[model samples]
Target: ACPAPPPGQPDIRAIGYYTDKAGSVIDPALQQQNKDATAPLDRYAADVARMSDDYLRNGDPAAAQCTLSWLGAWADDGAMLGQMIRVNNDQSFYMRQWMLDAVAMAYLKVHDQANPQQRARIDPWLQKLARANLAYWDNPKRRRNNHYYWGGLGVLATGLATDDDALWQAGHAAFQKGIDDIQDDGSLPLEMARGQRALHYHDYALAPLVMMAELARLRGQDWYASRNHAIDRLARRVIEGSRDPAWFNQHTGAAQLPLQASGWVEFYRLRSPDGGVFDAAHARGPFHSPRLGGDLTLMATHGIVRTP
Candidate 1:
């Protein structure tokens, strides 16, 4: 069950979870508390998906059933659901996106093979998660940039999981908004305006956009070419700046910091197999993000590549 509001406090939204614009928790104590509470759930969700995928790949019904039992128990737990909703309300977009991705990815991994019994057991929980994500992103308060990118990814994932084109289209629509927002110089005006973290946010935005493009392609839409290949240009600009960030420094008047290349190479390679984008991410190693279902390099391409 959800936690009750403190006596005389009518609004639980005031119960704060501190995170700055840069996405770091503001206080160590609060951070530790948050981590302690949610880490188990995070690991459980991530591991279940990974195990399910492994089982599916190996044709191990018993192992897959074991993972299904784990997922069932977790879904049946009202307390975890409450915690998810409460934390989402308090932590805003980050938690919302993370939890949605966890559930959506887990469902996608096993949904096709799972029997009707399993689908009946799991579908409601996934719907609840999708609703929670939609409610938050649809609130009209969330800003564009990395936030919307994540929102689009969540919507796209859940849309596919539930076989709902509306959700998928909404996701693509939001993504297209970002595509339209890209400036002529291959920069996102909103991300570029993020002060010293301009480059960081641009890189951040790439992760979801790349995945969204993959999803779009699966649906037979050409999102990569939608805005005159805007994402391609953005990718090139960021890759160049990553290799030599002096341009970023000159633009932001901030020191050129090391770039955090995401799983873009894994995704981009799906479209342009011989693009030579794989080495950068290959050397960077397994691409992991808790929200994106742990190691995306493994999830997307099983972390193997055939170079041209």
Candidate 2:
């Protein structure tokens, strides 16, 4: 990561996350522009990510409160993100979807510790962001690909944060759709068509889908076992793809990305606990991702694993 500048002022009214990509590939010339566009949002998430590591991994309560103060300012200040609906383009919409995931996860972890007034302001502000995500993804016809799953995660995290039933149901619907989309071969048609990034998208999609399945269990709804355990089918493909991406390359007519270390595997193993998927997760113990409430490995084994 480049040296992170100061956390961007929370007055961001609209934003986007991608600018250099053509389809699933990036254009070299616009690569810097792409980073610039999302830099501020990343800085904000860095604060959340930093606190998650400090309080969660390092076990320092005061470190977390210090970061919460900054987030509280964002919520309490006048110009909330995406406040101007008209200026909010698809770019900003897409950017908000992702940052919402990270931010909501952070809030869920630490909201209980935040001062009541800070929680008061941040809760509604985060809920507004979640509702905006729901609004964008409420379409009956949107592709149930990685983006949709990520949006579901943002909505789900926000739902859990606020104890909002409507958002929970919406998140549930998204989780169900993800299961429905997995084919017998553990492949997603939309993801397979991602050209070179087919395997990459498969891995990326698994992250949020797996988290949602685990999150659903908080309410005693074990979605991980849904649809004949379709998630296993998907996970099997990703695990296999990691070992030999030629399987995906053969389908996409382009070489696929070799699977990087996936952090969601730990969450999957906690519940499934058996089979090749479980074995693979066993081999790859101690995974981590800030988007999944950070310090996932520690959260699973030592800390309060529940999202709260």
Candidate 3:
């Protein structure tokens, strides 16, 4: 839904997605890759919850207010109206993968369990945002064959929630297309061209599929099972210890060790090849921003995941 404070700010979608909402036609052809896997969503869930607890316990309303505003900005669909400051309108927008995946997960977590009133507040915004994203995906002139992250996740999220079968079919087709582009060895041909950024593809790629699985589970559909299988095989090779190298097969910019992998993932890790204890020690909570410390001490100490 949103990222935590300090680095927390308006996202590319909040800014760019809203451009169409205005009287201006900024091109529905522009797709948001940050839909399901954006930074704000992951870090906020893992980081913000702990941060808020700390502030509330410390009795600092100022800190709470500041954190809430920061978190709220990312969560609020209305905030997208404030464009320009977030990202240059004309950029190529290749990194939207990270943004959408993160956001989609956060949206699922918050909306699914929230009370009716809370759902009412959150769902409308997500619905409107999803509608805007659909327009972008449906445009034929863009000739965009298949988007990787936000594009795929946005469609899946809207389609499942609203029961929009056409959107669901389109997103599933794009996902299959992207998977087809991958080599049998599990490496993404597209990311290899990016060199350094290719390492993060595991994080980016699995996001929409996760949403598809969760959405299917929510809607009682069988398609999620197929998506889950694809995710498990891929995650085992990349995130879990398997025949494939866990570390990005590079030296520079690669995390010192395979980024410790553990958190509330979409596919049940234990159920398949990727299933194993993601040792909480490795989990950096939701947000993986470099600015935050390497470890989220409180989550590790309290045994929260084990508690409930």
What is the descending lDDT order? Answer: 2, 1, 3
- In candidate 2, position 245 carries an lDDT of 87
Task: Give the runs in model 1 whose Cα sits over 4 Å from its true position.
Answer: 1-33, 78-93, 273-278, 302-308
- Error of model 3, residue 124, in angstroms: 3.9
| TM-scores, each model vs. reference | 0.79, 0.85, 0.52
Best by lDDT: 2
Give the per-residue lDDT digits (tens) of candidate 3, residues 1-308.
Answer: 33334443444432343243221233343334434434454455445444444443454544444434543455464533223233434222323333333333334323323345444444455455555555655667653422444466656654654446776776676666554554555555554433334444444555445445445555556553453345555555456422233345552233322334433242344334233444342343443321111112432233212111
**Residue 124 lDDT (model 2):** 84
Better structure of 1 and 3 per TM-score: 1
- Kindly list the per-residue Cα lDDT of model 2 for residues 158-199, writing each as its tens digit: 898778889888888888888889999999988887788888
Instruction: Point out the higher-scoring one by TM-score: 1 or 2.
Output: 2
In model 2, what is the error at residue 126, expressed in angstroms? Answer: 0.9
Residues 6-57, candidate 1: write the lDDT tens digits: 1111111212344555442346676676776556556665666566556545
RMSD of 2: 4.1
Give every collision pair in model 2: 13-82, 15-92, 16-91
Query: Can you give the lDDT of residue 209 in candidate 2?
Result: 88
Residue 233 shift from truth in candidate 3, angstroms: 4.1
lDDT on C-alpha atoms for all candidate structures: 0.63, 0.71, 0.43
